[PDB]
Structure 1
Amino acid sequence: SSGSSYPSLLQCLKAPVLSDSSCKSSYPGQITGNMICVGFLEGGKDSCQGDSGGPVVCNGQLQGIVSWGYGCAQKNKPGVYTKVCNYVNWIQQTIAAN
């Protein structure tokens, strides 16, 4: 199931939410209000291909969904995540009606 490049074992990473200013500075013209940056501006630690869809959990709450980035773990290019605190009503209403 892991194929040619993915690890067999689930991997974990502790990483901080970054300021909106740092996120837009890292990705000029590409950040909307529905995105947050999480990670390290120094690079070296990040999510990567195969992680998309997975969780960013802060103080027991789902705050991000792995989405995209330029490369992986590159300097000044932290991971970009779907901002889950924009979507609780979409999530709850979709579940309630389906």
Structure 2
Amino acid sequence: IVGGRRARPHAWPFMVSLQLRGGHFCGATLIAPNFVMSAAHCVANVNVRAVRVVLGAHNLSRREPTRQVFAVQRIFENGYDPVNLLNDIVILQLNGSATINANVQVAQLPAQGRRLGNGVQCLAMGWGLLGRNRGIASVLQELNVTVVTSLCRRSNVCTLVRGRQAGVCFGDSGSPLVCNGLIHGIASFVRGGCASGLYPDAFAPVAQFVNWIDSIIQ
């Protein structure tokens, strides 16, 4: 997240860090005690047996006893198209169920088909790079963004920060976009680099997949 701010500790208890040997590589969202939701491109080219799902984290550079760590037992995709970056969503079933508490909570999802109009105010978040240069964040970052429909696609939810170089960056893929308390987006891709100030960031549109999500998580 470029141009954001630190989140207050555990403000977003559905937020998930997906990790490999070298640490965080993607975000995700807890959508049931034993399911998290991320971008399909986050795991298409990785060994899913090696992925660790870290719940209840805040500062990735510290040992945090509030953390719960799971492996991925099964994945579910729904027609992912990596060339056109369409249907960029994956559900990861954990090898167990999270213990729900103040720090680990399940996110709420919108109704099937709900489409956000131009101008809706949202919040992005993640542990991605803090700038086009510089490295991943330690503390979870959040950023006020606005839904936009110009320079977008109907198959995406896109967001912009007016008149500033701010937006998602590398390592933010898979992270939720929260609008009116609901998870409306999964970070997918950027254009012309991070935080160009010109091209909106693109999110997979969660509301278009709710019937499928519900069939998997019951």
- TM interval, short-chain normalised: 0.7 to 0.9
TM (norm. structure 2) is: 0.37
Partners of 2:156 and 2:138 in 1: how far apart? 29
User: What is the match of residue 13 of structure 1?
Assistant: 143
Larger Rg: 2
* Identical counterparts, % of pairs: 34
For the aligned residues, what is the CA RMSD? 2.0
Residue of structure 1 in register with 2:156 after alignment = 35
2:190 aligned with 1:56: no
Is 1:92 matched with 2:197? Answer: no
Aligned partner of 1:23 among 147, 151, 155: 151
Question: 66, 69, 79: which one pairs with 2:190?
Answer: 69
Q: How many residues align?
A: 87
Aligned to 2:167: 46
Task: State TM-score, norm by structure 1.
Answer: 0.78
Is the 2:160–2:197 Cα contact (8 Å) retained in structure 1?
Answer: no
Q: State the shift of 1:7 in Å.
A: 1.3
C-alpha displacement of 1:75: 2.9
Any stretches of 5+ residues in structure 2 without a counterpart?
A: 1-22, 25-60, 62-133
Runs of 4+ in 1 over 3 A off after TM superposition: 1-4
Q: Unpaired segments of 5 or more residues in structure 1?
A: 25-30
Instruction: Give, in angstroms, the shift of residue 85 of structure 1.
Output: 1.0
1:15-68 C-alpha deviation (Å, 9 max, x unpaired): 01112xx133xxxxxx3x321111235451101110010010011011111100
